[PDB]
Structure 1
Amino acid sequence: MAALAPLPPLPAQFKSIQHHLRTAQEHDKRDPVVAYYCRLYAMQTGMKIDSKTPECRKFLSKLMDQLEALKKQLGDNEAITQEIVGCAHLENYALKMFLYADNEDRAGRFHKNMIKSFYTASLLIDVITVFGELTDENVKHRKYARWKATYIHNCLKNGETPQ
């Protein structure tokens, strides 16, 4: 039911965060909480790359409103009001994807989904780093996912069956 007005053309400047906002737009249909936090991360990295540019200004204004819209859309939400609750929710999401990938490995089958799953998990980790605090598992998971993601990708590229 919830929806946000269309966003202007995306310049190469925000290409690095394109994957972030892109996933957010997708989640908007799955979960608004994830999108809200996701958009927050994009904004931070956005302003850092380009504070306020007469051109990007349009993108920033729209993006900023998008987050504001979600806030009012829900209104009284623990995930929004309580950061701790939202933090635990995000962590759980990463765990679900993390296990899913491991489950596929045990099955003795590898697919492009595994790499995508690991990549998605890493993205969530960043969204969590925004809190300025990182857990031991969060940091370890990032490295583990980075290695597994690359290792699996490299193995396939070399035509070798992953371990």
Structure 2
Amino acid sequence: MAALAPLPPLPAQFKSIQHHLRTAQEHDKRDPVVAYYCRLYAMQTGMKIDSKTPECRKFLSKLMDQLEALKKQLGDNEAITQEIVGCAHLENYALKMFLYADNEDRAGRFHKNMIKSFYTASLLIDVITVFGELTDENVKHRKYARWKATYIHNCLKNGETPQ
């Protein structure tokens, strides 16, 4: 296991994945499994958005290189080799985060920390889709997480206590 050098300035054309990359940077230390899959999403999303401009072409090339090196570092890892356990693990992680926010939600305790939990949970769901699965059930949750994320945030700006 080792820490790879940071990627060069990220253009605005990748503002959408910008957050995803940062999330991986953090998860990289806590858990390379999530960070690994996270990088995959970026690359897949990166090419989907574009695939030209010497800036992008180079960016993708660099990102791809990091992915290859990362996979090698782990070697096998049941989480990487066997997507079966890796996927199941991701699902559990998202659930724990979501439930945690839900637990405090009904408890009548709202805060910025929870806001991040809902939003972050949404990012995790995206990382799950890359697998190719993703059922309607998860989709419903994503819609709720996004709504709850903004609903609370929007209400915060308005100066109103969540409910």
Superposition TM-score, scaled by structure 1 size: 0.92
Quote how far apart the aligned CAs of 1:9 are: 1.4
Contact 1:21 1:38 in 2 (8 A): yes
Q: Deviations over 1:1-35 (max 9, x none)?
A: 52112311111111111000111111111000001
Q: Which has the higher helix share?
A: 2
Quote how far apart the aligned CAs of 1:68 are: 0.9
Greater shift, 74-83 or 29-38, is seen at 74-83
Q: Tell me the equivalent position of 1:68.
A: 68
- In 2, the alpha carbon distance for the partners of 1:41 and 1:121 equals 15
Quote how far apart the aligned CAs of 1:157 are: 2.4
Quote how far apart the aligned CAs of 1:100 are: 1.4
- In 2, the alpha carbon distance for the partners of 1:68 and 1:105 equals 40
Greater shift, 36-45 or 134-143, is seen at 134-143
- In 1, the alpha carbon distance for the partners of 2:21 and 2:115 equals 19
Quote how far apart the aligned CAs of 1:53 are: 2.9
Q: Tell me the equivalent position of 2:4.
A: 4
Q: Tell me the equivalent position of 1:47.
A: 47
Query: Structure 2 unaligned runs (5+)?
Result: none
- In 2, the alpha carbon distance for the partners of 1:22 and 1:145 equals 20
Q: Deviations over 1:72-106 (max 9, x none)?
A: 11102111111121111111111111011112223
Contact 1:98 1:118 in 2 (8 A): yes
Greater shift, 42-51 or 143-152, is seen at 143-152
- In 1, the alpha carbon distance for the partners of 2:122 and 2:21 equals 15
SS across alignment from 1:5: coil
1:107-118 pair list within 5 angstroms: 107-118=107-118
SS across alignment from 2:54: coil
- In 1, the alpha carbon distance for the partners of 2:93 and 2:54 equals 37
Query: Structure 1 unaligned runs (5+)?
Result: none
- In 1, the alpha carbon distance for the partners of 2:52 and 2:115 equals 35
Q: Tell me the equivalent position of 1:157.
A: 157
Q: Deviations over 1:19-75 (max 9, x none)?
A: 001111111110000011000000111011221432222211111111111111110
SS across alignment from 1:133: coil
Superposition TM-score, scaled by structure 2 size: 0.92
Quote how far apart the aligned CAs of 1:112 are: 1.0
